[PDB]
């Protein structure tokens, strides 16, 4: 399917024990999707002083149209030194590796896959 239902944990930034996906823009989108596809992978909602706490490069969900069944259709962004790699819409937040940190919410999405 072009498209996968996900329900993805929201973690707080000082939870989180893998701050990023890699060390490349090309491996951090490659494992971003792979945690993805394994349910793997947390959220965290971007404010002041979230980012700077995040291992770059960082890979944003972002929507890509205005959401089936309460999911919102988001595609992959990901960034580095303030370059982005892909276009989209607005940030829902940015993905980490989950590895049993609690959440304080799910984001329903529709994964562009």
Do not use: N, W
């Amino acid at each position: 399917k072009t498209h996968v239902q996900l329900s993805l944990p929201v973690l707080q930034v000082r939870d989180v024990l893998v701050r990023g996906f890699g060390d490349s823009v090309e491996e951090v989108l490659s494992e971003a999707r792979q945690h993805l596809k394994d349910g793997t992978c947390g959220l965290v909602e971007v404010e002041k002083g979230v980012l700077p706490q995040l291992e770059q490069p960082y890979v944003f969900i972002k929507r890509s149209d205005a959401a089936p069944h309460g999911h919102v259709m988001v595609e992959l962004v990901a960034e580095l030194e303030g370059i982005q790699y892909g276009r989209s819409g607005e940030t829902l937040g940015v993905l980490v590796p989950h590895v049993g940190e609690i959440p304080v919410a799910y984001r329903k999405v529709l994964l562009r896959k």
